[PDB]
Design a protein around this ligand. Structure first.
Ligand SMILES: *Cc1c(COP(=O)(O)O)cnc(C)c1O
Ligand SMILES: [Mg+2]
Lengths: 383, 125
């Protein structure tokens, strides 16, 4: 179920993916056991593959869409508008207009401009005020409203007769301290209360995403939820009737995908100096940082290559993309056997922010989905 | 200089050139005014991100800038252009990524040939 389809596709060019839907079902069950009070709204931007969205639709998740395209896709799979939230940090009038025309109610905002645009194109929308979180991974621009701004925006909203029904926040994947959630939740409550003073009856809490997609991280998912749950019980008890949702992205899809790339070029580099004398290799593959490896440029990610052909002396080696750009370096240094043009290399945990572009002209790599018998039975359960 | 557009949140002035240079000042209420140097070429707007940290209210400033690019300019794309050799390159990339920008492949026809620069693009629907 793992490398069998991989090897089968190796035996009988272009870099391709093998994805395990069963792993995704596992992720969903795991979410159900870890956060029983929280409804997951899958962040489509993470991986907008039709099969993923269809699987999660069948299992009954919501959908965090960020554009007309994602909304159209999700709707074209039979998903009711009630399971969709439009949560783009920066929306245009036309976008919001499309949301209004197509039945989408839940929508985020963190600014007066977004608010006035919403009042302009989508009145009677159910607004969810996005609040900022502690930035200890960092960003160059502040996202989400401060508490003061939150109050002012609430007053402005009631002033514009717009309905504010809740609060959202988004810690992000760069989190190293689960405390960041608690604080945020605390703050959300403080905003909820503010709403009560303005005359709003808020019921929707959205704790966003940022939850890890693999165990190859420092802060595990269960370690985060184990801190989230008591925070929720304290600041948002069940008796209040609060509806709690989240916007997980990488958590659902990261570990389900394995990428196979092919070595398209090869160079030998010998460093000589009298007084190291070191022989190293560098390989060029048919994918890179402008393709599936944006994470190299985004998060300075350290990906680890895996031999599809496990064996041999090991040499210091580097792996590069096909663009020959100074930034298209996938692996700076790793120990590998001497490989050849035409050999394959595998990279695991490649489901999040990898696939899909259309702008660059780079056609989406082929994906092979695999589901075991029992996994397909469990799939048939939800549907 | 030529007065291009004036809104309640923006003031744009044009500088003389072949392709139209637009100095775009955002004026958000209770927020410091922000000047962006942009260029309009081939139905696309290219915005120069200046060295150093981005000013307060850069998010809303960019929101109104984008809205101006779609509504008034009727642009097909908006480009973020910045010096590749920055210590905060990844932070910028992440930021505009959140805003909806995607990394442009070096050598793309819609991007000028400058290997010392990073480009992200935003496409309207
Ligand atoms: C980017 C983003 C996410 C991403 O979630 P991940 O689990 O980190 O992939 C979720 N929600 C919103 C609103 C986002 O903008
Ligand atoms: Mg996640």
């Amino acid at each position: 179920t793992a490398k069998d389809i991989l090897d089968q596709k190796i035996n009988e060019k272009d870099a391709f993916y093998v994805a395990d839907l069963g792993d995704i079902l596992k992720k969903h069950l795991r979410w159900l056991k870890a956060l029983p009070r929280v409804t997951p709204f899958y962040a489509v931007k993470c991986n907008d593959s039709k099969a993923i969205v269809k699987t999660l639709a069948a299992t009954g998740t919501g959908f965090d869409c960020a554009s007309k395209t994602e909304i159209q896709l999700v709707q074209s799979l039979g998903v009711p508008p009630e399971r969709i939230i439009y949560a783009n940090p920066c929306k245009q009038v036309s976008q919001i207009k499309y949301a209004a025309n197509n039945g989408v109610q839940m929508m985020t905002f963190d600014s007066e401009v977004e608010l006035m645009k919403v009042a302009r194109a989508h009145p009677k929308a159910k607004l969810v005020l996005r609040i900022a979180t502690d930035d200890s991974c960092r960003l160059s621009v502040k996202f989400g409203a401060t508490l003061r701004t939150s109050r002012l925006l609430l007053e402005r909203a009631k002033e514009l007769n717009i309905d504010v029904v809740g609060v959202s926040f988004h810690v992000g994947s760069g989190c190293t301290d689960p405390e960041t959630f608690v604080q945020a939740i605390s703050d959300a409550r403080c905003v909820f209360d503010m709403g009560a003073e303005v005359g709003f009856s808020m019921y929707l809490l959205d704790i966003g995403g940022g939850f890890p997609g693999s165990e190859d991280v420092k802060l595990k998912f269960e370690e985060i939820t184990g801190v989230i749950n008591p925070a929720l019980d304290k600041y948002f008890p069940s008796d209040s009737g609060v509806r709690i949702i989240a916007e997980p992205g990488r958590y659902y899809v990261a570990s389900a995908f394995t990428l196979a790339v092919n070595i398209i070029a090869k160079k030998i580099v010998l460093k000589e100096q009298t007084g190291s004398s070191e022989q190293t290799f560098m390989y060029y593959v048919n994918d890179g940082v402008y393709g599936s490896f944006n994470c190299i440029l985004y998060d300075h990610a350290h990906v680890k290559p895996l031999l599809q052909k496990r064996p041999e002396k090991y040499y210091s080696s580097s792996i590069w993309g096909p663009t020959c750009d100074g930034l298209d370096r996938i692996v700076e240094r790793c120990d590998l056997p001497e490989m050849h043009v035409g050999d394959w290399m595998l990279f695991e945990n490649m489901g999040a922010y990898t696939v899909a572009s259309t702008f660059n002209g780079f056609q989406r790599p082929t994906i092979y989905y695999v589901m075991s018998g029992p996994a397909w039975q469990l799939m048939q359960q939800f549907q | 200089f030529y007065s291009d557009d004036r809104l309640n949140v923006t003031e744009e002035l044009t500088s003389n050139d072949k392709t139209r240079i637009l100095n775009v000042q955002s004026r958000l209420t209770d927020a410091k005014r922000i000047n962006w140097r942009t260029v309009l070429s081939g139905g696309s707007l290219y915005i120069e991100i200046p060295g150093g940290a981005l000013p307060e209210g850069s998010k809303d400033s960019f929101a109104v800038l984008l809205e101006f690019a779609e509504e008034q300019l009727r642009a097909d794309h908006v480009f973020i252009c910045f010096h590749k050799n920055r210590e905060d390159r990844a932070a910028l990339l992440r930021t505009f990524s959140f805003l909806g920008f995607e990394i442009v492949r070096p050598g793309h026809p819609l991007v000028p040939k400058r290997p010392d620069a990073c480009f992200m693009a935003y496409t309207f629907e």
